[PDB]
Amino acid sequence: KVLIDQDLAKIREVAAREDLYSLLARSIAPSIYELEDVKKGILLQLFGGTNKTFTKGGRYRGDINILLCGDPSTSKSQILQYVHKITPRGVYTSGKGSSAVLTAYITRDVDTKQLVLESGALVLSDGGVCCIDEFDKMSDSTRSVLHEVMEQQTISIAKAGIITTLNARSSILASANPIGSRYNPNLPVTENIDLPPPLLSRFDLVYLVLDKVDEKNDRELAKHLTNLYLEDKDDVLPVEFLTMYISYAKEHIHPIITEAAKTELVRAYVGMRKMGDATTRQLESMIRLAEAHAKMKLKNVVELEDVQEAVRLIRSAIKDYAT
C-alpha cells in the first residue's frame, strides 16, 4: 500500500532573499517566459486573502477567482494542468460535460439496490484550487450555479431525498476562447467574451492573451520549445520548497491590515474613483489582494509597500480596457 521542520531554516534563508518575488514565480513554470503578473497572481491564489469573519455577520473568506483568456498558440491548457499538478487536491474539469445535477452526483446503488446521494466535483475542490476548461461553452444550468459559490460559497440541496446545504470552498480558475479568432482592438472586452457581465466583474482579475507580430519572442519561443522537444524533456528551481512553504504559511501566517494602510488605501481609492462614466468591488479586490501579497514572504502585518504593485496589477487590466 505504501482513517529502509529542520528545513525551515532553509525556508527562512530563501525567505530572506531579496529576489524572492522573481525567483519563486520564475521557478513555477519554465515552459513560458512571460505572464509574470499572471504567475504572481497564481502564486497569490494559494496565499489568497485573510478569512475574516465579523462579530455578527461578515464571514468573508479569502477566495479569489481569476480567469485568463485570449488567442491560441499559448499552451494555456498545459498551464492549467500544471496548476492542477501544483494543487494538492486539484480538480481539472472542462466544458459541456457538466450539469447542475460538478455538484449533486446523486445516483443508484448496485449491490444494495438503493438510491445513494453523492457529492460532486466541486466537493472534491473543498480546500484548494479547481480547474475548468472552455468556460464560455457551459450550459444553462452549468455556470449559473457558480453565483452561489462566488457569493455565498455554499451548495443548496433541497429535493425529496435530502434537504440540506453545505459549503465547499475552492479557488476557481478557468479559461475560455473568444468569439473572433483574433481579439480585435476598438471593441469592448465584455463584448468579445461569452460571459455574463454581472459574473464577469464578479471575478477577481481578467487576463488577455494576444498574438504578437514580433520575431524576438518567436525566436526565444522556438529555441525554448526546440530545447524542450529535443532530448525529450542559471536558475534555482525549488520543486517542493514552495509546496511546503504554502502549506506552512497557510496556518502559521496571519497578515494584519492595520491603520497605516488605510491612509494609502483612501489615497489610492479617490484616484481610482476618479475614473468613471470604479465601484466598491474594486476596493474589495485591492484589500483582498494586498493582504494576499502580505501573506507571501511570511509577513503577519501589512506594509505601506506591496500595495503599489497590488493596485497596479488590477490597473494593468484596466488600462487594457480602453480600446
Binding site: 479568432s181 519561443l221 522537444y229
Partner: protein, 53 residues
C-alpha cells in the same frame, strides 16, 4: 478569413517534428538530416492549400 489561417500553434511544430521522426524511421538508420525535415515541411505546404486547381 482568407484560405490561410490566422495563427500557427506550437503543436504544428510538435507534429512536424514527430512526422520527420517517422520519416527517419522509414530510413531505418537514425540518420536525421536536412531532407528528413524537408519532406516533413513538404507534406505540410502541399497538404494545405491544394485547392489551387
Amino acid at each position: 478569413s482568407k484560405f490561410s489561417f490566422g495563427q500557427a500553434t506550437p503543436r504544428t511544430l510538435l507534429g512536424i517534428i514527430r512526422l520527420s521522426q517517422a520519416l527517419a524511421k522509414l530510413r531505418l538508420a537514425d540518420m536525421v538530416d536536412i531532407d528528413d525535415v524537408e519532406e516533413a515541411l513538404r507534406l505540410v505546404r502541399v497538404s494545405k492549400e491544394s485547392l489551387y486547381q
